[PDB]
Design a protein around this ligand. Structure first.
Ligand SMILES: CCc1ccncc1NC(=O)Cc1cccc(C(F)(F)F)n1
Ligand SMILES: CCc1ccncc1NC(=O)Cc1cccc(C(F)(F)F)n1
Lengths: 304, 304
């Protein structure tokens, strides 16, 4: 019993973290096989960041200008290329600690663990969600760029996120491991709008199933609703419209608890319309949307 | 910017997790040097747990009855002894992945990371606090026993917790790495009372400093208070009495923000008396007490 915002064990990712220096800039890199991936803004200076011409800036750089340090050993750089907003530094040594890995582009609403790093050294690990507006509400400071987000399926690490920017609003923006930013964000120090962020309805419902599984049942009621009626309420409270796909994904949790998905929606509808009334659910005074149905099943069944 | 419930990177601890089987029971063990530490209730059966006589039960066991598996290799057990509520299995091989480590007994209110494990395999990592009543609000299932709690100072892992029990109330109880339980709890399947749990006042204040540092300032007000006046309010709301030690520990956060500790106490006093009024602080609708002043400084300064 008990339910926590659990992150994946970070060991497989710590073994890939390197430090990348280019000129005066130092940030983190990801060493997998003979390649170090890092944000391309490592080649920029404080003046450059207003409107950098990355192709022009990268032309002024040679393999020897990229200093890559793994712990305390220096890696020799034999190649450099730009792929979208990431630089790929080919090194002469394959990382002996490379785990089985994939590069995956996650969907908004999906969750992942972040290993925040500074100077190629890991400082902490936390569980995040890619917001519907493609931002992440992380915990990153100057030097954290290059820190990655990932998921783990037994021995395979799926890298999904690389940290690049903090938006003026304090929220975080980054790329997949191919350098494609999530959302409309560009790697420029300019005014950038994160869209309207909605609440991940399927995740909130999954978390209500986790609550019932773990003893918190007060919010359960004698009511039911329809997908259309529920979505009228979701619209008003800036929640993601619930679809039959979402209902189907909640199927295992519905079967485990014996509470029909639309019955759980009616409970959520009443929580949205009436609030918590000073009560808590799983130790929280708000509706938690950073646990997917998969996270709930995994945590409630002890998947290692 | 941003503030998350961040756990330490778990790599150094994953490399120590082994599986310990004894009879029909399987749980986790901690392999450091040539010793595997695990909860002594590994020698028990379902009948035994009502009132086990551990000295008598352990006498029926020999080195060969303790099956220790590290990943997929079997460890040879050349010694076994009981130290309080932990069994120490001497193995013939020192763990090649043993980090620099200490065994420390934490204080109530201090925080730590837990690496939840099943069958000697890590499943997730989360940040916890040792409650004032010596319980932890963890996320553990059957098989999680032997999972450890720890802190990291650069390269040294300080092990502070070993998971042993889930109390009938759904809260978790365990020991230091010498087998001494935190709190009055015993390793018997009996009625066990966790005392009155209070809110860790110094941690809530530290989290209010983290909020101001990270942009959330609405709760700040034109008032001040005294340690005695604040403690009258803390008493009423089951908060830990604030002492001059607590004030002194908040000194670095007070100096960083320029907000006197007693001014922050007045803000907390008003939040206790008036509630949040449907607002949030650092994305939370309640007063968070699982970040110590040290955690706040560490996260806000990027200590690796
Ligand atoms: C406050 C520093 C910080 C904090 C939390 N995450 C990240 C950072 N760092 C940055 O955002 C660096 C930076 C500044 C300007 C422009 C760019 C861009 F090229 F990516 F667009 N990067
Ligand atoms: C529900 C299983 C579980 C879940 C979350 N943490 C732990 C557990 N397991 C146990 O508590 C095992 C157990 C049962 C009875 C008595 C004892 C004791 F000897 F330690 F006292 N241990």
């Amino acid at each position: 019993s008990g339910f926590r915002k659990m992150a994946f064990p970070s060991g497989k990712v710590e073994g890939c973290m390197v430090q990348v220096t280019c000129g005066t800039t130092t940030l983190n890199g990801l060493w997998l096989d003979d390649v170090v991936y890092c944000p391309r803004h490592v080649i920029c200076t404080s003046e450059d960041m207003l409107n950098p011409n990355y192709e022009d800036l990268l032309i002024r750089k040679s393999n020897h200008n990229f200093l890559v340090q793994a712990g305390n050993v220096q890696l020799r750089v034999i190649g450099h290329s730009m792929q979208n907003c990431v630089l790929k530094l080919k090194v002469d040594t394959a990382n002996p600690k490379t785990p089985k890995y994939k590069f995956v582009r996650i969907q908004p609403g999906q969750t992942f663990s972040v290993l925040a790093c500074y100077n190629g050294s890991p400082s902490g690990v936390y569980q995040c969600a890619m917001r519907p507006n493609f931002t992440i509400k992380g915990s990153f400071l100057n030097g954290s760029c290059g820190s990655v987000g990932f998921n783990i399926d037994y021995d395979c690490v799926s890298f999904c996120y690389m940290h690049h920017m903090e938006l003026p609003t304090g929220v975080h923006a980054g790329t997949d491991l191919e350098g494609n930013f999530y959302g409309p964000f560009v790697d420029r120090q300019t005014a950038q709008a994160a869209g309207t962020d909605t609440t991940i309805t399927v995740n909130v419902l999954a978390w209500l199933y986790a609550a019932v599984i773990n003893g918190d049942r007060w919010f359960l009621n004698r009511f039911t609703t329809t997908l259309n009626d529920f979505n009228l309420v979701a619209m008003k409270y800036n929640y993601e419209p619930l679809t039959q796909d979402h209902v189907d994904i909640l199927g295992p949790l519905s079967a485990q608890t014996g509470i029909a998905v639309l019955d759980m929606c009616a409970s959520l509808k009443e929580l949205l319309q009436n609030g918590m009334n000073g009560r808590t659910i799983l130790g929280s005074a708000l509706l938690e949307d950073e646990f997917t149905p998969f996270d709930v099943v995994r945590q409630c069944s002890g998947v290692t």
